Design a protein around this ligand. Sequence first.
Ligand SMILES: NC(=O)C1=CN([C@@H]2O[C@H](COP(=O)(O)OP(=O)(O)OC[C@H]3O[C@@H](n4cnc5c(N)ncnc54)[C@H](OP(=O)(O)O)[C@@H]3O)[C@@H](O)[C@H]2O)C=CC1
Ligand SMILES: [C]C1=NC([N])=NC([N])=C1[C]C1234B567B89%10B%11%12%13B85%14B%1158B%12%11%15B%139%12B%1061B%12%112C5%153B%14874
Length: 186
Amino acid sequence: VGSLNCIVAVSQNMGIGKNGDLPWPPLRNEFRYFQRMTTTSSVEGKQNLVIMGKKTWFSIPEKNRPLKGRINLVLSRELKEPPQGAHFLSRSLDDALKLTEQPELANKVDMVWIVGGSSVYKEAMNHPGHLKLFVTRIMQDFESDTFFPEIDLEKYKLLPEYPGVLSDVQEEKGIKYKFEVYEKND
Ligand SMILES: NC(=O)C1=CN([C@@H]2O[C@H](COP(=O)(O)OP(=O)(O)OC[C@H]3O[C@@H](n4cnc5c(N)ncnc54)[C@H](OP(=O)(O)O)[C@@H]3O)[C@@H](O)[C@H]2O)C=CC1
Ligand SMILES: [C]C1=NC([N])=NC([N])=C1[C]C1234B567B89%10B%11%12%13B85%14B%1158B%12%11%15B%139%12B%1061B%12%112C5%153B%14874
């Protein structure tokens, strides 16, 4: 796999989770952005792959698992088989990426999207090669118990814009946020 993508929503104090859920109230269009970005592929015959940790998997409501229209892969060192509803299980990101090139998935996967949590982001962000980070900056502090790792600006560049991503400040339920895209190349 020649490139990876991460996607996250983060508060001002770098929080991504609290008590197994989001630190802020649910933001519908922010969620719809996550859905659009991770689901959309114009390559006929293929789907995108979402990779996530075990806690992130169980944070998704049962009725919404697996994430529709995407191949769902869960990372765990302890499970022997995927959690019920998930399509695949791997012990590591690198193992996950090798799996996509074996016969079952060979001709089936377009984009790869890392969707959390902290440890999966940390690993992905240090993976060699081209990687983009789609980061929604929630422009307030929220009490959090799970945090997004620091973005290394020696490696990552804030892109000034990105096709299909809105540039202006957004607001839903009185909460301001903005969509950012970062990239590294080595
Ligand atoms: N705001 C946002 O964008 C997002 C928020 N969230 C929030 O974050 C929280 C969940 O995230 P977090 O607590 O960080 O947990 P994770 O989703 O990363 O799950 C942790 C578990 O996943 C497995 N795992 C994680 N990383 C790896 C690794 N790279 N290799 C192999 N296995 C791995 C391990 O399972 P095992 O013990 O079985 O080995 C580990 O104990 C929730 O509050 C959720 O709501 C989650 C995603 C994004
Ligand atoms: C709100 C959000 N927004 C962005 N831009 N990126 C994310 N990674 C998330 C966090 C999400 B959503 B969907 B489920 B649902 B649950 B699981 B899956 B995605 B993971 C958590 B919530």
